[PDB]
Design an enzyme around this catalytic site. Structure first.
Site, PDB file in Angstrom:
ATOM      1  N   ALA A   1     -11.254  -3.653  -0.638  1.00 48.39           N
ATOM      2  CA  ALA A   1      -9.822  -4.264  -0.254  1.00 48.39           C
ATOM      3  C   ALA A   1      -9.390  -4.173   1.342  1.00 48.39           C
ATOM      4  CB  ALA A   1      -8.943  -3.407  -0.944  1.00 48.39           C
TER       5      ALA A   1
ATOM      6  N   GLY B   1       2.698   1.223   3.555  1.00 47.62           N
ATOM      7  CA  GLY B   1       3.708   0.163   3.857  1.00 47.62           C
ATOM      8  C   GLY B   1       3.538  -1.133   3.284  1.00 47.62           C
TER       9      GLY B   1
ATOM     10  N   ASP C   1     -12.153   4.747   5.509  1.00 44.52           N
ATOM     11  CA  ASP C   1     -11.804   4.091   3.902  1.00 44.52           C
ATOM     12  C   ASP C   1     -12.376   2.763   3.956  1.00 44.52           C
ATOM     13  OD1 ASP C   1     -10.587   4.232   1.622  1.00 44.52           O
ATOM     14  OD2 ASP C   1      -8.519   3.618   2.524  1.00 44.52           O
TER      15      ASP C   1
ATOM     16  N   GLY D   1       0.776  -1.186   0.060  1.00 45.91           N
ATOM     17  CA  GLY D   1      -0.075  -0.071   0.071  1.00 45.91           C
ATOM     18  C   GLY D   1       0.837   1.394   0.102  1.00 45.91           C
TER      19      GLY D   1
END
Ligand SMILES: CN1C(=O)C[C@@H]2CN([C@H]3CC[C@H](Nc4ncnc5[nH]cc(C6CCOCC6)c45)CC3)CC[C@@H]21
Length: 274
Positions: free
Chosen positions: A138, A35, A134, A32
């Site tokens: 995913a 990290g 968010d 990502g």
């Protein structure tokens, strides 16, 4: 509490943070903007190690310590920054909808339970006065029983902001404008429900419409129906339950944040569906 790990301990569990993919014989699960994620083995138990920024490291620990639920990823420890989580053998819902690496398509039955679980996870966060910020497929992980676990609370908040964060394809119009509200999480969940019904990614440059949320308008304007968009990689979908999950997604995707249903109503509607 969480286990306080030392960087060398976590280095050797990950084959010296082997940046090679697992498919070639390395330890790199994925990456990502914050990290890299590594598969780790801690005394025969499989873990996910996230080597990362410090504000998001602390926020993830602050939210994980407060929020413990069946439908949230579990954090085991922390350490150059590293976060250690319970390994999700069935990766993300995004990967499973894409049948990534040759995994079989999810049935309508499994999709319904994943949506129900995901909503229970969001309900728990909102009950505890936390906005995820968010919500996307995913960030919905799958365990050994395909139980939905909400992940990535690095952006979570316990209102306006000059630092507009989140995924563009999933964001509410007011979130894109700087507002922080649990209502924006509702909108993003509606996009997840559309991905679950259609098996389509939220954004595709090679598509008309490019954004999945715009299929709501194509359907309202009677150019297409939900039937035209149901994922063809299922044999067990029925128009009744598909339409009931679409009605929930339609309600979540209302442009006016106040006209959207709260997560408790969302949770209640997905329950009635089965
Ligand atoms: C190669 N690929 C890439 O480069 C991108 C594609 C997607 N990836 C993902 C699958 C899910 C994985 N995440 C976990 N996988 C197992 N168990 C877990 N426990 C907790 C986590 C989260 C880690 C992040 O922080 C929040 C908790 C996690 C990250 C990589 C797989 C295939 C594709």
């Amino acid at each position: 509490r969480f286990h306080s790990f030392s960087f060398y301990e976590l280095k050797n569990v990950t084959n010296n943070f082997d940046e090679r993919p697992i498919s070639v014989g390395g330890n790199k699960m994925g990456e990502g903007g914050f990290g890299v994620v590594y598969k780790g083995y801690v005394n025969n138990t499989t873990v996910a190690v996230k080597k990362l920024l410090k504000q998001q490291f602390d926020q993830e620990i602050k939210v994980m310590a407060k929020c413990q639920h069946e439908n949230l990823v579990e954090l085991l420890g922390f350490s150059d920054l590293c976060l250690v989580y319970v390994y999700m053998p069935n990766g993300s819902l995004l990967d499973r909808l894409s049948c990534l690496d040759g995994t079989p398509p999810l049935s309508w039955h499994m999709r319904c339970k994943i949506a129900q679980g995901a909503a229970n996870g969001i309900n728990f966060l909102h009950e505890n006065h936390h906005i995820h910020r968010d919500i996307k497929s995913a960030n919905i992980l799958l365990d050994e029983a395909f139980t939905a676990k909400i992940s990535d609370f690095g952006l979570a908040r316990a209102v306006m902001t000059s630092r507009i964060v989140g995924t563009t394809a999933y964001m509410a119009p007011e979130a894109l404008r700087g507002e922080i509200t649990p209502k924006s999480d509702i909108y993003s969940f509606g996009v997840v429900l559309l991905e679950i019904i259609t098996g389509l990614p939220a954004v595709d440059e090679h598509r008309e419409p490019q954004l999945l949320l715009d299929i709501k308008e194509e359907i309202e304007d009677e150019e297409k129906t939900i039937e035209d968009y149901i994922d063809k990689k299922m044999n067990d979908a029925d128009s009744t339950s598909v339409e009931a999950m679409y009605s929930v997604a339609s309600q979540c995707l209302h442009e006016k944040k106040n006209k959207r249903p709260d997560i408790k109503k969302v949770q209640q509607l997905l329950q009635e569906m089965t």
